[PDB]
Amino acid sequence: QQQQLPAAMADTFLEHLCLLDIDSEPVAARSTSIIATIGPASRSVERLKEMIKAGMNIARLNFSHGSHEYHAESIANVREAVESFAGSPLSYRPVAIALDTKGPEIRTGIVELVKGSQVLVTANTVWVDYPNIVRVVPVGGRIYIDDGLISLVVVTQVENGGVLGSRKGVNLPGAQVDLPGLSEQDVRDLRFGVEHGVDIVFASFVRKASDVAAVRAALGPEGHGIKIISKIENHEGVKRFDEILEVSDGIMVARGDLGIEIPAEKVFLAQKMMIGRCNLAGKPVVCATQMLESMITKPRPMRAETSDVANAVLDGADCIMLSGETAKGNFPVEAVKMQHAIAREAEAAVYHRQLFEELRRAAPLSRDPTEVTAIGAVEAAFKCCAAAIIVLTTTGRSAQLLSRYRPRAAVIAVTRSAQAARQVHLCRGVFPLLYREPPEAIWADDVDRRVQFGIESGKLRGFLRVGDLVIVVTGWRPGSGYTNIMRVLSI
Amino acid sequence: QQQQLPAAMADTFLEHLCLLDIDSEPVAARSTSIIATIGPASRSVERLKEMIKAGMNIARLNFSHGSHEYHAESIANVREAVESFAGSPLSYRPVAIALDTKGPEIRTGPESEVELVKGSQVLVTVDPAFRTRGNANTVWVDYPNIVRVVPVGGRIYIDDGLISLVVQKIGPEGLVTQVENGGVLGSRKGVNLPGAQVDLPGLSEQDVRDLRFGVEHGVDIVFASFVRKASDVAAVRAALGPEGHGIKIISKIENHEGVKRFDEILEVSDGIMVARGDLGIEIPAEKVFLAQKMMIGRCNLAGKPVVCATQMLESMITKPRPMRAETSDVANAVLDGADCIMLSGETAKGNFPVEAVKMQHAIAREAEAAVYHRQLFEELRRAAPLSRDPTEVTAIGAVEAAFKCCAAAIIVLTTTGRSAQLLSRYRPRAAVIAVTRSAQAARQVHLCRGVFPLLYREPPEAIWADDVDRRVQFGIESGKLRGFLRVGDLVIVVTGWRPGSGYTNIMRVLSI
Amino acid sequence: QQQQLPAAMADTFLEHLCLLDIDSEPVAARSTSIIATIGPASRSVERLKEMIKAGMNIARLNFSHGSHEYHAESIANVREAVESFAGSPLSYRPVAIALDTKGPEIRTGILQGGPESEVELVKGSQVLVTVDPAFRTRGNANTVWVDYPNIVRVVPVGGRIYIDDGLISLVVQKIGPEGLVTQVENGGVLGSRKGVNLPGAQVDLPGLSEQDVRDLRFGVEHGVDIVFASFVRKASDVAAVRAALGPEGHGIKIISKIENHEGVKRFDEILEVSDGIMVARGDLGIEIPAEKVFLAQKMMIGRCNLAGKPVVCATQMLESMITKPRPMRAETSDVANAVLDGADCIMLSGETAKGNFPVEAVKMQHAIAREAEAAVYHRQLFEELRRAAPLSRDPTEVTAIGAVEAAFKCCAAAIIVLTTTGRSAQLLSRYRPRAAVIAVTRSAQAARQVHLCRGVFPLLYREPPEAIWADDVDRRVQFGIESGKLRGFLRVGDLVIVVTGWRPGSGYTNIMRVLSI
Amino acid sequence: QQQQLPAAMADTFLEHLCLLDIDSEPVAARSTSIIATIGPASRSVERLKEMIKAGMNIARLNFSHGSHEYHAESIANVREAVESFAGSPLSYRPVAIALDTKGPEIRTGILQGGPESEVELVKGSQVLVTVDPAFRTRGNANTVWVDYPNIVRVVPVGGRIYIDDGLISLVVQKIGPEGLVTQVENGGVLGSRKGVNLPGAQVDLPGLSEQDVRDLRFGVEHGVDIVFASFVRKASDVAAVRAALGPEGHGIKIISKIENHEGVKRFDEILEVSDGIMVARGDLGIEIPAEKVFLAQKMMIGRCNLAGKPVVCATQMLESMITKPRPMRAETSDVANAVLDGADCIMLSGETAKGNFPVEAVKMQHAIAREAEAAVYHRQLFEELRRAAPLSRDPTEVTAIGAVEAAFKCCAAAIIVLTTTGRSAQLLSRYRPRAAVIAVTRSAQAARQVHLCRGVFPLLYREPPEAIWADDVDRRVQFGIESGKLRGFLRVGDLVIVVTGWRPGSGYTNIMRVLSI
Ligand SMILES: [K+]
Ligand SMILES: [K+]
Ligand SMILES: [K+]
Ligand SMILES: [K+]
Ligand SMILES: [Mn+2]
Ligand SMILES: [Mn+2]
Ligand SMILES: [Mn+2]
Ligand SMILES: [Mn+2]
């Protein structure tokens, strides 16, 4: 068959593994959304169009670099490239915009560190943007610079040498960095965020629930809608994951920083744990950093990078991301393309049998009519190999709860809320459709055309063929919060 | 707790995932054996000693390069470094030596980097006269029939698939092409022709000479390149000759056809190497993982070693720290079920050979503790067919007994490793300490996850019963000495009712 | 908690067993329907009213005894008792009426001098079974006449013949030119015209006599709801019954009774064609060794369950009560295990037709069934059904399963379905929701037949259809709730799943909604 | 295949149920041991021989009746019948002897010059419950004398008294000064000296009268092997029994009978202290509502299974056979479900002590148990036990589980264990191998007590020890095999798991070996 159906029907995971078939072509829209970081290499309107076709879902603005004006152009160009296919509402692909916070980053200033040499922190001199650095490093203490390559030992002795450039990483383990999760800058940044209507915030170095309360606050009332994604970048964040989660809209497994703050051998446990948990919680999780680095420079990924992406997806990740691969490398589109291609395969390899079982089995009872509908809708879909679940949603919550259970059928989410449509990419397998029509006199009719719109757009992009069954999820009255109906229709 | 015990006790895989704890230190010998490739960077006796300390179990000799003499030194140095710790039998680590076959390779026609422009014109000559005359527009190539198999609109890849050539004028003197993916070309690099039915045989006159060399110098294992079908290994066994029935044959799966005929290849090989390198060119990059996952699954089910290889840690050929992906690569290989993981450029030529070995060690230990044994043992028991081989019966009893008392180890007496191999099939968490008189057996056993071989030197006792006991005692002692076993641990001990192989049938529970 | 909820939440069956709590009161309409057999003891209209209150869902007419007239009173009385509560539509309980076919009886003769006389067959004495037409009547201490000619042809030298409800037994020691020269194995008192069973040996006699045919016609005439068809041995045997049933009776459900080795052996093919199965332990417990029935019973139920077709457990579930006011320790467990096995219906024969404790017996089955119903490890059971029922593209099935899943998620008190033939109700019950299936229908007959499905509670809707189809649907749902409140299936604050369709007429169920009371 | 092997290999319980095959003959010694109660009908040496052949493993002496002398003959005859086959050590079957305590019972009194005579407590009539010593012998239709002085002090107005298997029932409505004036609720034939129970009212009677104590001592003198201890309500109740038992009886196994609500409620604590459990359905089925026993039965068995301790299912499993040669459909399923529930032993009371079919009864349990034994879904059951039994560091337990795993892998015919107290055998059986546990011991007593464990088949070894310990072990193993061939547990070509220890004397089992026959 296709979509690894023989593997999907195995009675055990081992069996399932044993039936994975390289000639079994994927046959299903990829559901893992791709976040690409905007930079010199991917800023041009025209470059942006190409990245949208290759499958970019979310543009990441990295406030670790660039100016306010510099990023507004970034935002402006994304919006232009995106509005260039508004030609055709059935085909039009929304693209989220995510501000990625600078936070307690410690960086160098504007030569080779000789292992053994005496090297000061205020070839041998390193200026740091953290003045309190000399309040938090005791004697016999370690300081890591530029992606953990350069090691220093506090006056400091170099323990690991390395080539150093301008303005690069600083990480201080062991010591608890009183440096605040939110500088005066971050605050200004987040305000910029609200002004330009970013959709998502990726919040650097979150160490505790307060850290997000901070962000929400700074975000202001003009930004209740914005989703907040807490980036876990160090030992403490990991340790207090639960609490962070409870309060964040979802998580970013920030492997970069993390891979320095804690020993490299351990990330995978962190990554696997965190995704597991977000999955259980029903909240977006992003896997990030270095998934495809070699491509910053080469047109083909290395054998490890490939398996990285697949394992991220198999792990359970809602989104996968690219940094240098898209912001600066010589192969931005090719990189997007590859994640697309890999994600589809891994998506078809997911052992839904075990996965759906386990989620049902661990999600607690519930009395929210929306949740009740979702799970029934998901069960119904599996029973008839439905091609899609089509939901009418006003904030995405309804789409989000369906995706929680990981249907194999696509969630086609129909909404009037441009913003909701953009944010919904954070949820695996949700395909948003932006509805433009003015409401019908009769509420019932207005529902129908929305469902119809959903099918139609559905046919058009190849999610649905004549003869397929589709599950349709609606509510008993207008306005959000009342999803409570599930119907089975044939195309 | 430690060794991710809270995760180990979960009722589900999801739950298990959720309980994975970064502060839970591993606390167990690493089981996944490491194969390190020998090159300029790792040939010095003293380098070799260091690599043994950091955890090298198996040395790969790559017959794609170097001369017979060149490899005999390789072998001679390994053996030396290894015999340097025979000072103390309790501590001594054997090391396998693996000959890796050249096979139907195709290579380009020295510190010289011709750049093959994007959207230019390339000629592939196979003409003696141009056996080196390979500039901006010319590449020679040691496979004549390249001109014969590659049709117009066919693909020709060069050097790890990074360079791309589409044929578009098949004419009198050779292959006129166009450069799709351009790039920097080097002296003598791999060539791949997907879609083409490269008529070259799995076993050249060279491979045959190579394998004979293998037998003469007593290599322990053959990694057999480009195996496409059962016959291909029959070839190898043949060439290997009678002086080499003992040698383990590991088929490398390097292309679409091998994958397609995996079952038949497996049934005949002693194990499998998932050759991601070539495989990552022959089939689309997006797909390897399915292959890798499938083949490991299958070898697991079958009970036969499987190797994950190539590009697990490349960035380290050049940098002292792995990239985020390479790390998870290694973990997932082990989590996938791999018996061995390997290193190529990372050890043969890179600037960080030992650091590389160290890392794999460090990662493998964590992933080893992350293995959901509850689901895994259940599924193996449940798919392995009944059996009437007393050795298999004992093994599974022994593996069950071990889980029941969190035994620190199973100690087996073995003459060919078969008994150890059957214990590891089931993936005990306890270590398999394998005591043998067969130097070779002790080497080959590294191909089995979680088997720790001990080479017994003493002359046999007058009383066979006594001779067994000392062997067991020898097992314990060495065991205490390397920190596999502490006083108060329980240990499962597996022996047989009479001397000579094939009669393992007894399992005993002892306290240290 | 109640309804053995702690046991319901266990992670394994063993665990589950361990958390069974005797102080955890059931709290849920019993789902296992009860079939009570009508005889002298339970024929009076007033007796029938009492049995309806105690929980009778199905009345069995046994055509092995009584005349056409005799059964028409039977039917007339039932209907009368039942129509006596039509006073209140919210409360009204329909009752099925099931004809139980006679089929290939094999009978001894009239007894020397009497239809009322008895003879005693002493253990170890010399005994003659003849097929000699003359002694059809002259039977005694050493002789029994049988109305199956071929007997002196089908029983080997050393075979066994079971007489009178399996209580007398004979071993053929010599084959005779006039009758099988046997030895008495099990002694006993022998009556006029009693039953024979012949295990091992094949019996060719037809599954449908001239009588059965007349009976089934009588069936159609009086509008029975269900036929329990005795000795079904093969698919043809039901085709026979359908046929005989005639066109005036396509509606009738046909329940094949498996009463011997061969039926068991051909169970699959019988099932494929029957509307469900009756595990006939009586005959069965004689045609095949007594040790074995359980495997049969357990097999058949498993299989029906898998198949989504009603299965009845029957015979001797409570016999001591034909005579005593309390069941023995075994009978009790029998009932529970039947329910636990997966049974859709459980039945009573002597216990209701003739015994001194008809109502008490019905009461007991009620009481036990409720307890077992709560002990069902739904967690494993729903998992296993989902996992083995094949994909499906019937919108009704799809809706059913989603409806069932939705219910578990909010401990819904009920699923309320609108159904025209019961199909939609039947599919929900297939999956064994713990919530009740309140089925609303205009088809008096459908409401009766639906009791064959575990946990389906039928409501007969009487109102003339509304001008607006949508409105008519709503009142039906409302009617479902209201009746639901009224009998204690639903309280204010409960959640309820409602299952309807997108247009009138059967076959189009395809909508599931979540409502709060 | 046989032994329901296709069912055994199913992937789910549903599936397993579906594949149960009535033509799949069992092929395996039956494992569930049978306890038969000794009475008039089963006391004769010769009768006892027959009962041994039919499969009796444990003789129950019921100290609720008979005298010390009367029971010593009981014992003396059992031992005789049993020693009659010592002719051949390979085939010799040991037989446990179990003393069943009287405890806090409460009987009505003897009847008006009537021994085997009866009287009817008419429904609705006027009945007086006395304690007047003078009325002890004057039982009648209007008067019932009870041996419980304090009855008058505990049964308040509108309190309930029930007599003889709970069939007779009395409503106290009047407190007089010489007795309790009761209304009869459930009328009926009353006999002499029949049981009384008092639900709702706590009974200040002690678990151990001066009699019980004398009884227990008698027990130790005559070397009974097991004590079934009536009405155990709490841990203390067993401490009592142990105590009374004295030091001359540390070896005796104590089986606590759970006979009422409180025992149930405090099961855990009773278990922790008893050697095993008897689910006393009789009393229990009166103390608590009949609908609930099954939960209790199922709970207790589950829990003893989890604990590793014998559990007995008892009372009324086969009553109809006290009087008839064939069991009713429920009794049969009762036995099978008891076995499928997880019971280690099943028992017969009236069926063997007094009825007209003692041996036939034993035979039937045998026959049923074999079938149910092969129906056990080992796949789920062994998984669940591994998964719930806690880690352990006892080398004996470790070896047992390995041995049990090994056996499953090769469909071993048997695990053969050398055991001194049976503890090694008991641990193997805990995991419920499908292979038989052939237990070889020199301890006649151990060999007798081991029947309390499912699927343990004890062999008594008679030879004087060999000079060389190693050789002595081997002959014991050899003895095991040989005896095993001889009774059909093992055939040439089978695999057998053999479990031994590293040194003599109990407590050191720690070795497992795989041998081919
Ligand atoms: K940042
Ligand atoms: K090679
Ligand atoms: K009949
Ligand atoms: K007693
Ligand atoms: Mn960061
Ligand atoms: Mn290769
Ligand atoms: Mn019948
Ligand atoms: Mn009692």
PDB file of N, CA and C and ligand atoms in Angstrom, chain A residues 60-65 100-103 105 107 202-205 231 233 257, ligand 1:
ATOM      1  N   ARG A  60      10.503  33.494  11.409  1.00  0.00           N
ATOM      2  CA  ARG A  60      11.078  33.818  12.661  1.00  0.00           C
ATOM      3  C   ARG A  60      11.941  35.046  12.458  1.00  0.00           C
ATOM      4  N   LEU A  61      11.656  36.108  13.243  1.00  0.00           N
ATOM      5  CA  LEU A  61      12.487  37.314  13.287  1.00  0.00           C
ATOM      6  C   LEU A  61      13.377  37.204  14.497  1.00  0.00           C
ATOM      7  N   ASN A  62      14.677  37.317  14.304  1.00  0.00           N
ATOM      8  CA  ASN A  62      15.550  37.054  15.447  1.00  0.00           C
ATOM      9  C   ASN A  62      16.117  38.348  16.015  1.00  0.00           C
ATOM     10  N   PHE A  63      15.531  38.783  17.122  1.00  0.00           N
ATOM     11  CA  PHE A  63      15.871  40.090  17.673  1.00  0.00           C
ATOM     12  C   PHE A  63      17.220  40.107  18.371  1.00  0.00           C
ATOM     13  N   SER A  64      17.948  39.004  18.258  1.00  0.00           N
ATOM     14  CA  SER A  64      19.319  38.954  18.673  1.00  0.00           C
ATOM     15  C   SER A  64      20.212  39.761  17.731  1.00  0.00           C
ATOM     16  N   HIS A  65      19.661  40.182  16.600  1.00  0.00           N
ATOM     17  CA  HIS A  65      20.416  40.890  15.578  1.00  0.00           C
ATOM     18  C   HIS A  65      19.469  41.818  14.864  1.00  0.00           C
ATOM     19  N   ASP A 100      11.305  36.586  17.969  1.00  0.00           N
ATOM     20  CA  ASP A 100      12.117  35.761  18.843  1.00  0.00           C
ATOM     21  C   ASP A 100      12.959  36.698  19.683  1.00  0.00           C
ATOM     22  N   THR A 101      12.673  36.689  20.985  1.00  0.00           N
ATOM     23  CA  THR A 101      13.258  37.607  21.978  1.00  0.00           C
ATOM     24  C   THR A 101      14.751  37.453  22.164  1.00  0.00           C
ATOM     25  N   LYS A 102      15.438  38.575  22.383  1.00  0.00           N
ATOM     26  CA  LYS A 102      16.879  38.510  22.642  1.00  0.00           C
ATOM     27  C   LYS A 102      17.150  37.864  24.018  1.00  0.00           C
ATOM     28  N   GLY A 103      16.653  38.521  25.084  1.00  0.00           N
ATOM     29  CA  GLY A 103      16.764  38.034  26.462  1.00  0.00           C
ATOM     30  C   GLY A 103      18.188  38.104  26.982  1.00  0.00           C
ATOM     31  N   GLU A 105      20.850  37.223  26.752  1.00  0.00           N
ATOM     32  CA  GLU A 105      21.945  36.781  25.924  1.00  0.00           C
ATOM     33  C   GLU A 105      23.182  37.445  26.436  1.00  0.00           C
ATOM     34  N   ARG A 107      26.946  38.220  25.004  1.00  0.00           N
ATOM     35  CA  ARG A 107      27.667  38.205  23.756  1.00  0.00           C
ATOM     36  C   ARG A 107      29.020  38.875  23.930  1.00  0.00           C
ATOM     37  N   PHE A 202       8.606  34.022  20.613  1.00  0.00           N
ATOM     38  CA  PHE A 202       9.431  32.933  21.107  1.00  0.00           C
ATOM     39  C   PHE A 202      10.262  33.564  22.152  1.00  0.00           C
ATOM     40  N   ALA A 203      10.088  33.175  23.405  1.00  0.00           N
ATOM     41  CA  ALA A 203      10.645  33.952  24.530  1.00  0.00           C
ATOM     42  C   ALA A 203      11.936  33.358  25.096  1.00  0.00           C
ATOM     43  N   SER A 204      13.064  33.950  24.736  1.00  0.00           N
ATOM     44  CA  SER A 204      14.356  33.403  25.138  1.00  0.00           C
ATOM     45  C   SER A 204      14.583  33.203  26.643  1.00  0.00           C
ATOM     46  N   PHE A 205      15.450  32.260  26.918  1.00  0.00           N
ATOM     47  CA  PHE A 205      15.804  31.842  28.243  1.00  0.00           C
ATOM     48  C   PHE A 205      14.777  31.682  29.371  1.00  0.00           C
ATOM     49  N   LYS A 231      10.960  29.379  25.200  1.00  0.00           N
ATOM     50  CA  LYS A 231      12.144  28.654  24.815  1.00  0.00           C
ATOM     51  C   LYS A 231      12.911  28.139  26.019  1.00  0.00           C
ATOM     52  N   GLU A 233      16.159  26.979  27.407  1.00  0.00           N
ATOM     53  CA  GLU A 233      17.538  27.089  26.940  1.00  0.00           C
ATOM     54  C   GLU A 233      18.599  26.657  27.958  1.00  0.00           C
ATOM     55  N   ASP A 257      21.591  26.807  22.819  1.00  0.00           N
ATOM     56  CA  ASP A 257      21.928  27.140  24.186  1.00  0.00           C
ATOM     57  C   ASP A 257      21.911  25.901  25.065  1.00  0.00           C
TER      58      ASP A 257
HETATM   59  K     K E   1      16.980  35.020  20.140  1.00  0.00           K
END
